[PDB]
């Protein structure tokens, strides 16, 4: 009932969500614990942008899995646009889709453009591209590039503001944030009579809840035996600072995305920072696994530079692109970590060994631009009402990690196209940033 | 009469006369005075502009006449001296330059008055993307809807012209030369004559400056110390400046100068202040007013102005709009109009005055006498000792009888805006820029 003790673990992406879901629901005994005052360092929601999109299905081409998908943007789109603690931190300026040969846009038109019903604008050729933003922006070749435009229903998310947002309205109905270390820094699950009862923090203490939410992004993995159905990945970014008139045509941008390279979106209000991401299949940190003899677990850590090879991809991204910038110096760059499912799909669900644990993970890439309303379709879980389409597909699923191959790409390309090991970067194979 | 102990007085301490005053004292000459009514550099020198372009053409045998064979003279020795002379070099970069127009008329007479005749190799600029090409990304971004060009690599490029001016000031001063140069000590009002000679020059304090010779180099202010008989038309031309930022401003070095016959030109933002200089193309604007002494008839008087025509600013977006749009709506930091003046044919004007024998005339810059600045002054020492050389001399003779019954409103060779010359006393008071005012 709404008078129930209900315990999030994780106040990131999810868990504020979440938290603000349950406040609205009428829930009058919330208490959310992290280890980081919001916004976390390591929550991969904690970033001046990410990409929103939402795109429906023809009725011909649809397949359960992205049904459910555009089931959750499609929420996520009409909050971005109505709630106003979501609605200010959403800039609809448009999304492009792009690759640069012919077996990567092909993929594209076949993925994404062909089942959907938006009516996307094909760029055929570098002029094509440096015309969907203002003059000066994009001065690049483009070299071999085509791709498609969707004007409308997709942009970006400022999505650190958003989380602050969300944090903030769920106090203000009442929910109780324990977040610091070590009184938030949950360490282990507690258990009685084979059924969660709460969780225990580094403190010592231990909070006792009638249901437990465990929202930790990629550090759940650390929390539960998800018996393989959680990959900890990391991706990297870096910020260049733009100057202060230069700064002024690089308003109101389209996400340029070529999904073998990397993506860029326009400079932050605050800072004045430009992000590049280079896309690549993902960094894992494979260790032992401690309750796997002779197998590797891939575990995360947090780190405020990335590696050279990282940069380099950057690099090579704004030669194409913005190559007037591709030699400025980075101001900022950092590893940023979520966790894949292995078919890249929520995973958000009853634990069926532990009823009173729900988990709610397995962002897989595509978590943030679902603040708005994930924790809707969480607490829809936790009433154990969520809708079947949506159900099926978010389940608990282990049959499906069986002997998981952990360096499987999972429809992600770039780089060397393959899944890296930081344990495999040496200790002066990164950025400095800050260090001279 | 003519020698080193001859006393010389040098009337305009501009872009010609701080030249001249330097090539004098390296010749040895001891006794030199200056006068301008302003200190160097002056506000009103055409010469006082953070660029000016440079550019030399050899022509083929067949495709000259004696006035651009003459010019070529001109820019050779010019050439030679800004990539060589100590006072100069420092100020000269040799970025190249590209001259383009944007209607197959325009297109045309490029081809044949600029490019065919000239030696030359040219490359072709045919696209957009062949213009943008030319300079680094992220600089012109425009479509350049209808432009056709031609860049000339090496052998022209641009000048600092005030730094310049500057700078051959200080080394004629380190050597020797007298500048007088504040009003009314150096406001020449007059020439002053005996014996049907001139004598020397009187100041606008009422003091009389005897001299052996008499060197009048005052631009275009010039027209009103002498009777030219036509010979020189006093007419203006206008620039603004943009501001650039601390990070932009680094993508926008070594630039070829873009010119546009019938738009304008940039030239890239100068070291001090990063501003971005753009000139809107037309054939001139003068000041008609009636003259003095020709009842009925006009004359072209100049005034100084730090600011420009609406019109003008408007012709220079125009122009930024067609290269780099992304700064077509950037606030003006600085502009003005300057003056230069004109002869019948558009060829410089140095010669002995052959009813007053003690007077040089060095004057008729009709744009295009700054690029001249390391050299000019060395033609017009020799003309004063009477062995200006063969190519040139007889192009740059006294000639009123070329400009008898001369049509002021002549465009000269020169295209953009309304193809016609425009008149400031057709320019409201209210229809000017508005830079620094509240
Ligand atoms: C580089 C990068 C680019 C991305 N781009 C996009 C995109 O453009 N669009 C998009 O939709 N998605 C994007 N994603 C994915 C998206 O960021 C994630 O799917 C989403 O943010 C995950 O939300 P979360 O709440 O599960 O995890 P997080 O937002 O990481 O929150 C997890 C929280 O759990 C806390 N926590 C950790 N350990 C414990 C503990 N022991 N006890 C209590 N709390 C703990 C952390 O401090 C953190 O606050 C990207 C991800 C990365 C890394
Ligand atoms: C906007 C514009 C752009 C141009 N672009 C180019 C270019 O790209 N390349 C190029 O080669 N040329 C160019 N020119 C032409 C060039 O500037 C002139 O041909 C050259 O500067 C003229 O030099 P000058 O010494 O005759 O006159 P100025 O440099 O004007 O000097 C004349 C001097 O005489 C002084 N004076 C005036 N009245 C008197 C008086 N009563 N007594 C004493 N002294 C007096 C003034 O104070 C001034 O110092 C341009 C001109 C303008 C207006």
Known sequence: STESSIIVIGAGTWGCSTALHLARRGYKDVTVLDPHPVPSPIAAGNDINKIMEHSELKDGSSDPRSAAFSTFTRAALKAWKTDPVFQPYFHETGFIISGHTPALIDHIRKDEVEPSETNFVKLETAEDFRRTMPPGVLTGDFPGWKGWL???????????????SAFNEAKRLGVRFVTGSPEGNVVSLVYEDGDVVGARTADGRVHKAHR??????????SLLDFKKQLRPTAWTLCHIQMGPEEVKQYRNLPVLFNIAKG????????????????????????????????????????????????????????????????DRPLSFARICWDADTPDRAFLIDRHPEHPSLL??????????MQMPTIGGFIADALESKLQKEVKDIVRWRPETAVDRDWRATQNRFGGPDRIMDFQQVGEDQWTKIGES
């Open 212 to 221: 437990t939410i465990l929202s930790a992004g990629a550090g759940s993995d």
């Open 359 to 368: 988990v709610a993970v397995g962002g897989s890439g595509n978590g943030a």
């Open 150 to 164: 969707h004007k409308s229903g997709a942009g970006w998310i400022h999505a650190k503001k958003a989380m602050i």
């Open 263 to 326: 993506f860029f979106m326009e400079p932050d209000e605050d800072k004045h920072e430009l992000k590049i991401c280079d896309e690549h299949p993902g960094y894992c940190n494979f260790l032992p696994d401690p309750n796997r003899p002779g197998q590797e677990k891939s575990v995360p850590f947090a780190k405020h530079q990335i590696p050279l090879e990282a940069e380099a991809r950057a690099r090579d991204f704004l030669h194409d692109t913005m190559p007037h910038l591709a």
